[PDB]
Amino acid sequence: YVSLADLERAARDVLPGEIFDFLAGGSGTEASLVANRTALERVFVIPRMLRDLTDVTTEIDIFGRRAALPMAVAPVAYQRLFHPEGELAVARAARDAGVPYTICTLSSVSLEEIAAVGGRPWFQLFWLRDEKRSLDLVRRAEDAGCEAIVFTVDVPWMGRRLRDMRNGFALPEWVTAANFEFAPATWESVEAVRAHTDLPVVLKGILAVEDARRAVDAGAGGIVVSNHGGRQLDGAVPGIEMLGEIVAAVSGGCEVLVDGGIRSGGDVLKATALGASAVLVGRPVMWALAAAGQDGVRQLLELLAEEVRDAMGLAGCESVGAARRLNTKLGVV
Amino acid sequence: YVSLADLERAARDVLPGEIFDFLAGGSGTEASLVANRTALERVFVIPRMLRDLTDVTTEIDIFGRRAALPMAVAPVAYQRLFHPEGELAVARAARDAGVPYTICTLSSVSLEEIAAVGGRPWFQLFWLRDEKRSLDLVRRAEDAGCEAIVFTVDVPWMGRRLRDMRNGFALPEWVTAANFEFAPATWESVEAVRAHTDLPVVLKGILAVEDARRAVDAGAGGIVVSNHGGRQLDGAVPGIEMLGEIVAAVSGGCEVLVDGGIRSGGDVLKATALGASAVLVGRPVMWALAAAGQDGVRQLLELLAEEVRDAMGLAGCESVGAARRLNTKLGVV
Amino acid sequence: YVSLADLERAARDVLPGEIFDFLAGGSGTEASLVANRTALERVFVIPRMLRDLTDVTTEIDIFGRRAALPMAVAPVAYQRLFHPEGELAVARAARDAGVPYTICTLSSVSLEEIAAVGGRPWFQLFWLRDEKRSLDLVRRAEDAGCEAIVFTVDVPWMGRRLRDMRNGFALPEWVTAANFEFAPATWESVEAVRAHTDLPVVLKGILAVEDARRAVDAGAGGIVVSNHGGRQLDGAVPGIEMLGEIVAAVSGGCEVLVDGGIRSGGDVLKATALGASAVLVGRPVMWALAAAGQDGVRQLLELLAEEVRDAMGLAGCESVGAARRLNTKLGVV
Amino acid sequence: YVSLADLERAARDVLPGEIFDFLAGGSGTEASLVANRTALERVFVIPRMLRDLTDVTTEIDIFGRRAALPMAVAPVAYQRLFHPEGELAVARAARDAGVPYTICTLSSVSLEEIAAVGGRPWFQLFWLRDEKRSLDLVRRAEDAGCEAIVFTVDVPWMGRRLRDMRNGFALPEWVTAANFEFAPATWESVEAVRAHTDLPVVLKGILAVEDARRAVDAGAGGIVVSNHGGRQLDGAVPGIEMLGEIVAAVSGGCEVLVDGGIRSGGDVLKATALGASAVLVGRPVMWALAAAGQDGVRQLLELLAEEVRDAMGLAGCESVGAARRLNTKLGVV
Numbered sequence A, B, C, D: 001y002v003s004l005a006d007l008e009r010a011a012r013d014v015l016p017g018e019i020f021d022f023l024a025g026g027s028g029t030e031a032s033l034v035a036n037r038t039a040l041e042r043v044f045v046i047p048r049m050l051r052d053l054t055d056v057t058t059e060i061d062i063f064g065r066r067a068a069l070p071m072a073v074a075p076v077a078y079q080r081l082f083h084p085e086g087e088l089a090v091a092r093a094a095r096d097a098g099v100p101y102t103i104c105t106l107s108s109v110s111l112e113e114i115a116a117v118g119g120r121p122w123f124q125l126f127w128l129r130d131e132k133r134s135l136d137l138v139r140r141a142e143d144a145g146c147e148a149i150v151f152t153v154d155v156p157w158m159g160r161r162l163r164d165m166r167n168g169f170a171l172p173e174w175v176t177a178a179n180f181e182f183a184p185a186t187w188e189s190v191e192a193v194r195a196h197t198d199l200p201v202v203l204k205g206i207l208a209v210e211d212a213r214r215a216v217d218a219g220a221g222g223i224v225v226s227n228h229g230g231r232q233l234d235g236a237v238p239g240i241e242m243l244g245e246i247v248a249a250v251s252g253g254c255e256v257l258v259d260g261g262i263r264s265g266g267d268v269l270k271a272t273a274l275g276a277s278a279v280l281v282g283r284p285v286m287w288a289l290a291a292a293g294q295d296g297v298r299q300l301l302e303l304l305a306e307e308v309r310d311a312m313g314l315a316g317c318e319s320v321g322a323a324r325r326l327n328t329k330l331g332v333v
Ligand SMILES: Cc1cc2nc3c(=O)[nH]c(=O)nc-3n(C[C@H](O)[C@H](O)[C@H](O)COP(=O)(O)O)c2cc1C
Pocket: A022, A023, A024, A036, A074, A075, A076, A077, A104, A105, A106, A124, A152, A204, A226, A227, A228, A229, A231, A259, A260, A261, A262, A280, A281, A282, A283, A284
């Protein structure tokens, strides 16, 4: 595999159509899904030359731990859909690559089993109709050694996924929500979680500047600037188009991550040049899992690590902080 | 049906080519027809998160009545072209959905019959060579219980519809103008109508800012920002591209509606975020009528209602007024 | 024929390939040829409503004569390439439509014969290596009753026409330059022509603002804002993209015409809304000549007249001057 | 051959696929490769008319020598891949056209042999792990009569060339680096070269404004504004998009060249109108070499010279300095 697109092709060959569509699809007309790619494609980096590259490092410190790359595996529900080892395959590969892995509330293997793999596990939270269930998930995660709570704030309910409707998609009987209904979360919910844990709370799905500022005021440790991979509001702006404005507005008050469409180390570099602390990567990790299980994910992470190092150095950046000081230019197509 | 595009496909299957072309077509090269879609596709919404969605409502008050959605059925002439029940099928479905229905001066069933269906009927007026005929239509409408007069101001004469010319299109003998020649309307005409009725007068086909302001000064109750679905001036700006400027200029002096290309609840949300009080929907209603008669229109209205509620909530809006306070970003393709 | 594109199709059917390519082609990669169309397609008009249209007139006064439309036939060399009656067919049709016809220095029928047709003939001048020949052409034109001298200033030499090179195109023996070598013209040349005639001198091929201003200072009666239909510098800006700036800079000091890509009455309206006094139309006139001779050109002029009247009225304009006060908006694709 | 694209077609016919891919390809997704063309295609020139063109000259003075055109042959490694005479064929053709030829550190014929051809040879330098080897190359070049040192500053290491990876590309045994490992160069390296030679040092691969300014401060004689033909950082801005800003910032302190995508004399004119002193041309020179050896390169240089003269004169420019005073407009597609 020499690009992440080689893994998409390999996953499409192996997965059943309806599962590939569950993975690939977005809501509505898929405008926001396509826009995540378009938005990245229009950003160009202005690289710097002639800097010292004797010790290029792709490491960052985030939520109190060193990560090997400015990247984490996004929360993706029901990974046993893609490979029989599901979440444990991905978590093992992430651990070995030094990348944080986000354990999902809708994981097909229990959060305690995945946490036992080791590494840098984070935990993603959905707010539930029964509040106490959500707060119990948080305590379970913390007790199991998760290092951050990624509170998904863009899913008062699931978006209209027309591929899934047309396919009549349903989980196979062999895939379940192993940690066991959505309720709209509010700012009250955020405070309840903040009060119930000592871990950093990261709000995932922020796009408005004022919501970023309010997240900082609310005591978030981070936000993920995200339109949920185009799966929630069809017509929501891509996160990459809001990122620079949001970075400026929080002015170092919390970590600012971005997701949606990251498909190369060069895309990681674009995101950092626009001000991101780190990115999440979703679909490509699942492509690698589907294609080749744990080894597939390992190969994908190795490929991304190589592409990030290559892009950084070609742009004159010996560290991620230097990459954040790069300038960009918007171009056409 | 899971999208409005499923209904287009179904209507194209059933209607004779020349009638489908009468419905689908625009004037000239169809540049303004295509632009209505392009203009919407470039608008992205910046959604808000973590708001109270306990009682999301899609209702509005307009022209003194509560409507179930910020939407009305646009005036479309000669609906018996599409289904034998024509206007009565559409009006019944609109009534049952709680959506206003605009009765046309060129209706293929008389305005009194359609008004007798009930619901929230509005009446669309063409100015005629014989003025007294136009003013008699207005009094007929008012006597029949219509609630607003939608004065079409963009049709001094009909545009050049090349599909209709190439097809040699003419009304079948079984379709007539049941209420029974265009004369250019002027501001004088508007005043004559304003003087002859107690109903709100809504000017449909406004695109210039100064004409919006003048409409308010003239005592209009509303305007529809519209290029007549690309059927009048070929090269006229889409209404969606003028809407925000117009909303700012009238500064709450009348209701500001928009039409042209609305094809989903997400498009309704875009229009409201740009400042619209409500939208009109034309072609899709006729697709649903052609495909499945009254039941078809009912299914379309149910689908739109679901998509509007979904988009609003995903964008953090418990009411249409909140949706009007959303911000937008122009994007590419 | 219901659009000008119907005539292109008809001309392509009848003309030999190499002659169609002589007509259609541009220089180089044809970027400027394509851009003339792109530039018009991105301009949208903001129409006005509810104005008095009792006496819509498409007439203008230009160079001391009334013209039936804000349009003239562009200078196109060697019209016998397209039809055996060549220039006389086109000039007769123009005369009968009330449109000025530009007689070319490279006409395939002598300028005195074409002038004898009557109508509103203008004369286009190429500066020649032998100056006296050019000044003798001017006196011949004036003696024959031409009403303006259209001095082409963008042809120090002919551009690189790759279609013609690839085809090995040469004039048939039956087509000659009937008035009988290019020399670069300068501002000195313009003055020599201004001194030798009482007719208005119109500089055709101006694109820079400062050259427009200098044209006024030099005593020009008009300019044509033009990239020579994409046939001269490949990469020259379209005239339509410079027009508004140029109109502002001359501030009524001379007539400002535009050409390049005008293919409908709506395009004429766009040009006038951007400030043009009138347009020239080239290729379409030759399509009509090739398809059907004099009658073809007559039908094209009738179609354009209808489309101009239609566009004007739909935009609320009872006169060309009102059309020049319309505003425009740049849109996408 | 009537355009440079005729030579691409001819080279593709003759070269083995993997060698054509070595030549054509870029790094990563090839976004920067495509963008070099897109960026040029959106620039339009505003030509001037009616200037004296009695003695149009395409000559420039650069690095103390007169060049016949504002163009040099870019450094391209391993030219024996394309034709058995390799670099000597190209250098001979360049010499005879009066164009500088850049001898590469990775030349497949020794730099002394190519310099012995005569003409205006420049020498391109890669910094090596062994510094002394790089400084010895510089002295060799100077001793052999090269006139400038073109220090490539964008290759701390080679970019990820996916075509070459997929093809398993390797040099044939019959092609070697005849002058005989990359080390990242720094500003220290530049100073070491500046101290070791009396020749002008030209930094190739500058894109950031501040790096241009620093190059002047460092005593560079020139820079080449360049993304290495899209072969280095995938997502690097095209040089043509930075050129005007860079020209303004150095404010005549060094020569500012540009490369990437120059495919015609009109493109040369665009580059000069944006402020370039001269351009480099890479791929097209190799197409001509592959197609027809020395004679091919001669024909390409003759074609470019004709197109540059044609574009200049059509734009009203009797000299390159006048071309640099042309204005431009950004257009669409
Ligand atoms: C199949 C699938 C399932 C997902 N499940 C969740 C989830 O349970 N929780 C969540 O916060 N995001 C979920 N996401 C969104 C991702 O975390 C992420 O925002 C999105 O995939 C990023 O874009 P990318 O896939 O383009 O890299 C899911 C995404 C996909 C494709």
